Amino acid sequence: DLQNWTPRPKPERKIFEGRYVRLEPLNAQKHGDELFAASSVEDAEQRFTWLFETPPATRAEFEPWLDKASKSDDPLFFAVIDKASGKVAGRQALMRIDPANGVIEIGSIYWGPLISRRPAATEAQFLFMQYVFDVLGYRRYEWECHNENGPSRRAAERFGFRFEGIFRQHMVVKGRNRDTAWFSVLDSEWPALKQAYQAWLAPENFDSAGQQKKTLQEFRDLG
Amino acid sequence: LQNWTPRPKPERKIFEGRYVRLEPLNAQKHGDELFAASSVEDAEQRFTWLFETPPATRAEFEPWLDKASKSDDPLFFAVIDKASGKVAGRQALMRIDPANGVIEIGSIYWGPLISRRPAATEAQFLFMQYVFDVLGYRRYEWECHNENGPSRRAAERFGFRFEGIFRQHMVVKGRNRDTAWFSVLDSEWPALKQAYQAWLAPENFDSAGQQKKTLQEFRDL
């Protein structure tokens, strides 16, 4: 197939609608107030530890980052809207976009308390992965995080990304060394992942308290 | 790293060694000699894993040469073999990250005047010294096609440490490329510098031009 390979399309500012979550292209006027709220919760400092940004101290102080992020084409930012509340719950981006080789990254992730460790967060990831493979036809979908960011590494593994390696001294972030852990999902890996996510996200998989009956790793194991 | 700042960008300057001289690539100055070196009998084998194909004619070489001469990233240098006096190959500093002090040595073409001779090792050394002792960078990268055995071996010999393979990283010349990644850290450089100095010293080569000890032997010390 690869002798005829040509560049794939660039990602677009599209709306993505799921059962638990909605993704909207980030817009300062539409999302600014609620994203500020999400980004300035009581434990925002802890939540932002490994991110490139620090939490905004005031709404006015948030505006410059918000405007740059809303206008940016790479990273391409989306607000993550929790459907149950209708509120912006976080943000994420498609980034390091390489249409020529069909390679792209999900990064710039902040999933706040409304969605963190709930089905909405898993579906936010899923909707990007689905778009990247089924619509854009990319070959390689990346996750990178600080190697010391345990929750992010475990999130990547749970999501089905495969570890590739650690770039030693890859960055300096907030006055500290960052070795970067890299993981990927290949186009050949996507179809089995898609089935496992769809099974996990199904309303059948959540009891009346909203608690999962089986985990995402369990469904992936089941094949 | 509380005090860490962005580092300077690399600049077009001349780097003068014992065996090799690196000059900022210039179409008029280097084009005819570099084309000659790039159209040697085994140019096809030498270009296999490069992004470029070997140039069939001087005219057909001009677009790549002009673009490479003007490029700021990759930032290209002609590799002049001092003994012969000829342009013998080319190489670049690339994927320049001043904020984090990360940079790659890449787009390496070393022709038969210097490949597997001390000049090639020195060509690598002069970039490595510039990156660490002058620019103050903290991570120096090498990447290649995973099936490029000679490049993987060269990176390991030169002291770069394997970090991993990016699967399906590129499509190159109609085929899949998984990319193998290697690095040298600033913390590793002072000891590595000494090993290169020992290896490149004239005293390490006998009257027949053969090394007495290998680069890897000096690195073990």
Short descriptors:
homodimer, 223 residues, alpha+beta, Aminopeptidase, 8-stranded mixed β-sheet, 29% strand, Ribosomal_N-acetyltransferase (chain A), transferase (chain A)
Explain the overall architecture.
Two copies of one chain form a homodimer. With about 220 residues, chain A is α+β, with helices and mostly antiparallel strands. Chain A has a single domain, classed as Aminopeptidase. Chain A contains seven helices and eight strands. Chain A has helices at about 30-40, 45, 60-70, 120-135, 150-160, 190-200, 215-220, and strands spanning about 15, 20-25, 75-80, 85-100, 105-110, 140-145, 160-175, 175-185. Chain A has an eight-stranded mixed β-sheet, sandwiched between helices. In chain A, α1 packs across α3 (about 60-70) and α4 (about 120-135) packs antiparallel against α6 (about 190-200). The longest helix of chain A is centred in the middle third of the chain and has 17 residues, at about 120-135. The first copy, chain A, is globular and about 50 Å long. The interface between A and B is medium-sized, with 27 and 27 residues. Chain A: This is GCN5-related N-acetyltransferase. Chain A: GO terms for molecular function: protein N-terminal-serine acetyltransferase activity; protein-N-terminal-alanine acetyltransferase activity. Chain A: It comes from Brucella abortus (strain 2308). Chain A: Keywords: Transferase. The PDB classes it as transferase.
Radius of gyration of chain A: 17 Å
CATH class call of chain A: Alpha Beta
The CATH topology of chain A comes to Aminopeptidase
Oligomer: homodimer
Strand order of the largest sheet of chain A: 1-2-3-4-5-6-8-7
Q: How many individual β-strands of chain A?
A: 8
Characterize the largest beta sheet of chain A: strand count, sense, and whether it forms a barrel: 8 strands, mixed
The assigned CATH architecture of chain A is 3-Layer(aba) Sandwich
* Number of distinct helices of chain A: 7
> H/E series of chain A, N to C?
EEHHHEEEHEHEEHH
| Whole-number total of structural domains of chain A | 1
Q: Report the helical percentage of chain A.
A: 25-40%
Question: Going by CATH, what is the homologous superfamily of chain A?
Answer: Gcn5-related N-acetyltransferase (GNAT)
Beta-strand residue fraction of chain A: 25-35%
The shape of chain A, in one word, is globular
| Classification by helices and strands of chain A | alpha+beta
Domain N-acetyltransferase (chain B): 33-178
Pfam families (chain B): Acetyltransf_3 (PF13302)
Keywords (chain B): Transferase
GO molecular function, one term (chain B): protein-N-terminal-alanine acetyltransferase activity
